Amino acid sequence: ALSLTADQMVSALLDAEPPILYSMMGLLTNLADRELVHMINWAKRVPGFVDLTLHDQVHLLECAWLEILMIGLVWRSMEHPKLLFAPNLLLDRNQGKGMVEIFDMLLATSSRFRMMNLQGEEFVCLKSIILLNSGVYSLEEKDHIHRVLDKITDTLIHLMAKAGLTLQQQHQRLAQLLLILSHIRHMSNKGMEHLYSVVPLYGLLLEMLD
Amino acid sequence: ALSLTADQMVSALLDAEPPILYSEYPFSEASMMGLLTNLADRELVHMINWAKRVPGFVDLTLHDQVHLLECAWLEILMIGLVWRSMEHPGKLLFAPNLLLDRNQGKCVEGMVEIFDMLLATSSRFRMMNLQGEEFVCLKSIILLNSGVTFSLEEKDHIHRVLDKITDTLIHLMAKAGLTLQQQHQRLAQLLLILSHIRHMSNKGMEHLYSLYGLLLEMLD
Ligand SMILES: CC/C(=C(\c1ccc(O)cc1)c1ccc(OCCN(C)C)cc1)c1ccccc1
Ligand SMILES: CC/C(=C(\c1ccc(O)cc1)c1ccc(OCCN(C)C)cc1)c1ccccc1
C-alpha cells in the first residue's frame, strides 16, 4: 500500500505504464483523447490512488490530466532536440506556427531533462507526484495523499542513492526535479487557457474510474 | 558570492526583505481591485530593489534580470501575501491595516477562488510551522526558478545559485533536529507547494486579463 519498499514502489510504477500510441488541432486532440483513456487506467494502478474515494480519485485526475499528458510528451521527446507526440508523429518548433511558445516551453523542459539525464524510474515517480499533488487542495485523506507523496519522495531519494550520487546531490537533484514540476504546471495552464480559443468531464471520469 | 556559507546565505536574504507597506482608505465596491492594484504596484517597486539584493541575481545580465522578474512577480507577491497571512487564520493580510476575510473577495467575480486557494496555502504553511528562514529561501527560489524559457551559460549560474539555496534550505532543516528523511521530505513538501503557488499565480493573471520598459530602466 505505502508499506511498499522504495523498490516495490518503482516496480509498481514502471508496471503501471500505459502503452505507446500511434495516430493540426484534430491530430493532437484525437491523440490526447486517446491517451486520456489509458491514463485513466494507469491512475488506477498507481499505489495509493485506488485507496481514495471515487469522488476524490476523480477530482485529482480532473486537476492533473494535462500535465500528465505534457510531462509524458516531454519525456518521450528528450532524445530529439523536436516534439515526438508518438513514434509516427514528430513535429518541430516551426510547425507550431497561436501554439508556438507552448512548444518552446515544452522543448525547454525536454532539454532540461536530457541535460539532467532523467531516468525512467525517476520520471515514473514524477508522474505519480503530479497525479496526487495537483488537486490535493469533512474527515480527510489529504492526510493519506500526503503520506503516499512522502513515500514517493523517499522512493525518489532512494533511487538516486542506489545510483551512487553523494548525499548532497541527492537533495539537490530532488530539488531541480520537483522544480520542473512548477514549469510543467505552468505549460499545462497555458495549455488550458488556449483551449478556450475542454476538460474531460465528471460523469465519464467517474464511470471508468469505476 | 556563489560560495558563501549557508549561514551567510540566510541572513543575506533575511536582510533584504522589502518594507512592510500600509494601504489607503466609504465601504468596499469593485473599486477594491483598484485598491489591490495600488498595493500591488507599490509593492512591486520595492520588489525590484529586493531582487537586486538577492545573491547571484545581479551577476546575471540585465535582460535576464528582467526576464526572471517579469515571469515571477505575481508568484513572488502571492507567496509573500500567504506568508504574512499565516498567523491570521481565515483572512488574508494584504497590509497590516487591510485584513480581508474570504467573504470580501466575493465582491470581484473570479477572485474568491484565488482567495480560497491562498487561504488553503496559508493554512498549509502554518500546519508545517514554516520558519521565516525557510520562507525567505522559497521567495528567492521563485525569483530564480520561474524564469530560468530563455552565451546562456547563465542558466548554469542560475542553477548553481539554486542548488546553493537547496543546501541552505536543507541545512536549516538539519539544524532544527530533523532526521535525514524528514529533511528530504519537508524539502519535497515546500517545493511542491511552489507548484500550488504558480497555479494560483496563473489563475490570478487570467482574471487580470479579463511590464518591460519599466523594469529594465528601473533595474539600471
Ligand atoms: C501541446 C500539446 C497539446 C496537446 C497534447 C499534449 C500531449 C499529448 O501527448 C497529446 C496532445 C493537447 C491538445 C488538446 C487537448 O484537449 C483535448 C480535449 N479532450 C480532453 C476532449 C489536450 C492536449 C496541446 C494543448 C493545448 C493547446 C495546443 C496543443
Ligand atoms: C489575490 C491578490 C491579488 C493581487 C495582490 C496579491 C498580493 C499582494 O500582496 C498584493 C496584491 C493583485 C492585484 C492586482 C495586480 O495587478 C497589478 C498590475 N500592475 C502590475 C500593472 C497584481 C496583484 C489579485 C491578483 C489577481 C486578481 C485579483 C487579485
Author numbering:
A (entry chain A): 307 to 329, 342 to 399, 401 to 416, 420 to 459, 468 to 527, 533 to 545
B (entry chain F): 307 to 331, 336 to 458, 460 to 461, 468 to 527, 536 to 545
What did the paper state?
The estrogen receptor α (ERα) is a ligand-activated nuclear hormone receptor and a major regulator of cell growth, survival, and metastasis in a large fraction of breast cancers. Structurally, ERα LBD is an α-helical bundle, with the C-terminal helix, H12, functioning as a key structural component of the activating function-2 (AF-2) cleft that governs the agonist or antagonist state of the receptor. The Y537S and D538G mutations are especially interesting because they occur at the N-terminus of Helix 12 (H12) in the ERα ligand-binding domain (LBD). Importantly, breast cancer cell-based studies revealed that the Y537S and D538G mutations conferred hormone-independent activation of ERα and reduced the inhibitory potency and efficacy of clinically prescribed SERMs and SERDs.
